[PDB]
Design a protein around this motif. Sequence first.
Motif, PDB file in Angstrom:
ATOM      1  N   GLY A  88       0.800  -1.241   0.000  1.00  0.00           N
ATOM      2  CA  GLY A  88       0.000   0.000   0.000  1.00  0.00           C
ATOM      3  C   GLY A  88       0.828   1.284   0.000  1.00  0.00           C
ATOM      4  N   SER A  89       2.032   1.218   0.561  1.00  0.00           N
ATOM      5  CA  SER A  89       2.916   2.396   0.694  1.00  0.00           C
ATOM      6  C   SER A  89       3.373   2.927  -0.645  1.00  0.00           C
ATOM      7  N   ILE A  90       3.274   2.097  -1.692  1.00  0.00           N
ATOM      8  CA  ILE A  90       3.761   2.492  -3.005  1.00  0.00           C
ATOM      9  C   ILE A  90       2.708   2.554  -4.087  1.00  0.00           C
ATOM     10  N   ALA A  91       1.448   2.328  -3.716  1.00  0.00           N
ATOM     11  CA  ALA A  91       0.335   2.702  -4.596  1.00  0.00           C
ATOM     12  C   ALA A  91       0.274   4.210  -4.778  1.00  0.00           C
ATOM     13  N   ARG A  92      -0.229   4.680  -5.925  1.00  0.00           N
ATOM     14  CA  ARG A  92      -0.494   6.101  -6.123  1.00  0.00           C
ATOM     15  C   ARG A  92      -1.682   6.554  -5.290  1.00  0.00           C
ATOM     16  N   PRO A  93      -1.682   7.811  -4.852  1.00  0.00           N
ATOM     17  CA  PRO A  93      -2.901   8.292  -4.210  1.00  0.00           C
ATOM     18  C   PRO A  93      -4.151   8.173  -5.104  1.00  0.00           C
ATOM     19  N   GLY A  94      -5.298   7.941  -4.482  1.00  0.00           N
ATOM     20  CA  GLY A  94      -6.571   7.949  -5.199  1.00  0.00           C
ATOM     21  C   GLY A  94      -7.327   6.645  -5.079  1.00  0.00           C
ATOM     22  N   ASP A  95      -8.530   6.599  -5.646  1.00  0.00           N
ATOM     23  CA  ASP A  95      -9.354   5.388  -5.562  1.00  0.00           C
ATOM     24  C   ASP A  95      -9.094   4.332  -6.622  1.00  0.00           C
ATOM     25  N   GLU A  96      -8.478   4.718  -7.743  1.00  0.00           N
ATOM     26  CA  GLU A  96      -8.261   3.780  -8.824  1.00  0.00           C
ATOM     27  C   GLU A  96      -7.092   2.845  -8.470  1.00  0.00           C
ATOM     28  N   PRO A  97      -7.185   1.578  -8.868  1.00  0.00           N
ATOM     29  CA  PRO A  97      -6.023   0.703  -8.735  1.00  0.00           C
ATOM     30  C   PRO A  97      -4.854   1.269  -9.508  1.00  0.00           C
ATOM     31  N   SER A  98      -3.668   1.139  -8.940  1.00  0.00           N
ATOM     32  CA  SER A  98      -2.501   1.821  -9.521  1.00  0.00           C
ATOM     33  C   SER A  98      -1.205   0.998  -9.577  1.00  0.00           C
ATOM     34  N   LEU A  99      -1.106  -0.099  -8.821  1.00  0.00           N
ATOM     35  CA  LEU A  99       0.160  -0.798  -8.640  1.00  0.00           C
ATOM     36  C   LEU A  99       0.239  -2.079  -9.458  1.00  0.00           C
ATOM     37  N   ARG A 100       1.296  -2.217 -10.248  1.00  0.00           N
ATOM     38  CA  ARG A 100       1.578  -3.459 -10.949  1.00  0.00           C
ATOM     39  C   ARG A 100       2.683  -4.200 -10.191  1.00  0.00           C
ATOM     40  N   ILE A 101       2.477  -5.494  -9.947  1.00  0.00           N
ATOM     41  CA  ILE A 101       3.465  -6.301  -9.173  1.00  0.00           C
ATOM     42  C   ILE A 101       4.033  -7.383 -10.099  1.00  0.00           C
ATOM     43  N   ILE A 102       5.346  -7.527 -10.117  1.00  0.00           N
ATOM     44  CA  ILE A 102       5.952  -8.637 -10.814  1.00  0.00           C
ATOM     45  C   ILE A 102       6.978  -9.298  -9.856  1.00  0.00           C
ATOM     46  N   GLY A 103       7.438 -10.482 -10.228  1.00  0.00           N
ATOM     47  CA  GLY A 103       8.532 -11.108  -9.515  1.00  0.00           C
ATOM     48  C   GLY A 103       8.794 -12.549  -9.829  1.00  0.00           C
ATOM     49  N   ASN A 104       9.794 -13.064  -9.110  1.00  0.00           N
ATOM     50  CA  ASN A 104      10.289 -14.416  -9.176  1.00  0.00           C
ATOM     51  C   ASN A 104      10.325 -14.928  -7.754  1.00  0.00           C
ATOM     52  N   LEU A 105       9.396 -15.822  -7.421  1.00  0.00           N
ATOM     53  CA  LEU A 105       9.256 -16.294  -6.053  1.00  0.00           C
ATOM     54  C   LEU A 105       9.714 -17.753  -5.932  1.00  0.00           C
ATOM     55  N   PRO A 106      10.608 -18.033  -4.969  1.00  0.00           N
ATOM     56  CA  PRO A 106      10.942 -19.401  -4.583  1.00  0.00           C
ATOM     57  C   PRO A 106       9.723 -20.143  -4.078  1.00  0.00           C
ATOM     58  N   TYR A 107       9.851 -21.461  -4.006  1.00  0.00           N
ATOM     59  CA  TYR A 107       8.731 -22.292  -3.604  1.00  0.00           C
ATOM     60  C   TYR A 107       8.193 -21.956  -2.213  1.00  0.00           C
ATOM     61  N   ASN A 108       9.074 -21.902  -1.206  1.00  0.00           N
ATOM     62  CA  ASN A 108       8.687 -21.738   0.201  1.00  0.00           C
ATOM     63  C   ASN A 108       7.819 -20.518   0.448  1.00  0.00           C
ATOM     64  N   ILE A 109       8.191 -19.413  -0.197  1.00  0.00           N
ATOM     65  CA  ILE A 109       7.557 -18.142   0.083  1.00  0.00           C
ATOM     66  C   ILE A 109       6.314 -17.906  -0.790  1.00  0.00           C
ATOM     67  N   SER A 110       6.052 -18.807  -1.759  1.00  0.00           N
ATOM     68  CA  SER A 110       5.010 -18.544  -2.791  1.00  0.00           C
ATOM     69  C   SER A 110       3.625 -18.422  -2.173  1.00  0.00           C
ATOM     70  N   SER A 111       3.237 -19.421  -1.365  1.00  0.00           N
ATOM     71  CA  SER A 111       1.891 -19.381  -0.785  1.00  0.00           C
ATOM     72  C   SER A 111       1.735 -18.214   0.200  1.00  0.00           C
ATOM     73  N   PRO A 112       2.654 -18.104   1.151  1.00  0.00           N
ATOM     74  CA  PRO A 112       2.507 -16.991   2.112  1.00  0.00           C
ATOM     75  C   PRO A 112       2.460 -15.618   1.441  1.00  0.00           C
ATOM     76  N   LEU A 113       3.271 -15.412   0.410  1.00  0.00           N
ATOM     77  CA  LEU A 113       3.286 -14.125  -0.221  1.00  0.00           C
ATOM     78  C   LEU A 113       1.999 -13.879  -1.012  1.00  0.00           C
ATOM     79  N   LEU A 114       1.534 -14.885  -1.759  1.00  0.00           N
ATOM     80  CA  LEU A 114       0.274 -14.754  -2.475  1.00  0.00           C
ATOM     81  C   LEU A 114      -0.877 -14.427  -1.524  1.00  0.00           C
ATOM     82  N   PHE A 115      -0.926 -15.094  -0.367  1.00  0.00           N
ATOM     83  CA  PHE A 115      -1.927 -14.730   0.642  1.00  0.00           C
ATOM     84  C   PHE A 115      -1.714 -13.287   1.197  1.00  0.00           C
ATOM     85  N   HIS A 116      -0.477 -12.886   1.494  1.00  0.00           N
ATOM     86  CA  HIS A 116      -0.188 -11.512   1.981  1.00  0.00           C
ATOM     87  C   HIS A 116      -0.687 -10.447   1.005  1.00  0.00           C
ATOM     88  N   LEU A 117      -0.496 -10.688  -0.284  1.00  0.00           N
ATOM     89  CA  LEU A 117      -0.868  -9.709  -1.317  1.00  0.00           C
ATOM     90  C   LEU A 117      -2.379  -9.524  -1.470  1.00  0.00           C
TER      91      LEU A 117
END
Length: 262
Positions: A88-117
């Motif tokens: 949330g700290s890096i979304a643009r101000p306002g009501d419209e969705p603004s943030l695009r996320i990309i990455g390369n996730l190892p196996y261990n962190i994949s589920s927890p991170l997908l749930f966090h997001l």
Amino acid sequence: KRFGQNFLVDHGVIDAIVAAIRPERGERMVEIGPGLGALTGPVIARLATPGSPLHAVELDRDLIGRLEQRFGELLELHAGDALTFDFGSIARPGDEPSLRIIGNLPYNISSPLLFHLMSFAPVVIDQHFMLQNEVVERMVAEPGTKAFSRLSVMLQYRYVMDKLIDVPPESFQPPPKVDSAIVRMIPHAPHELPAVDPAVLGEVVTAAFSQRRKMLRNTLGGYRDLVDFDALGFDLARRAEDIGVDEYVRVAQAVASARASG
């Protein structure tokens, strides 16, 4: 299991991933796990201009120094674990969705991170990840199939998802012993989500998937006093792993209705 580092090196695969993402100037984008910058460079080339950097999240100090040396102020790197980062700290101000996320996730962190997001979905335009193929198969799995899980249900409730590209081990130096894939996730708009309290959906799915291979008669047995699912036509001889997102939504709607007053 992650053994050391595996850096993407095949230029064709890198260019295919960039073409799938379509990074463009003006977009606010964050990369999780930039590594040595295999995707960071090409994304910066398309999307970053002075005053509008690509954002990144990374913890390893050696990798951070190397990236900052290579890309300078075209990169804005947030030093810390992505799992504990307030996106949330890096979304643009306002009501419209603004943030695009990309990455390369190892196996261990994949589920927890997908749930966090999931809690940031309202400010997110889309997500594109490189994951092991096993994980991607679970995200897009049909009910009753080998890979169908709690993750499948909660992500299919919240996002439209598509597997876009297969990425074989020779794409990487050194090659891992697993196949990988790129998956796209687009959050449903609020009016597109089913009319269900997401907290009650989560509760029900958590109960059912306690033992995903056991009958629902056992795993939803904590609801048996509150709701008679069999009386409503819901077959409790089936297993959690057999039931689709739409049916979970109906169970949750039934539970909320059973609790209702006024």
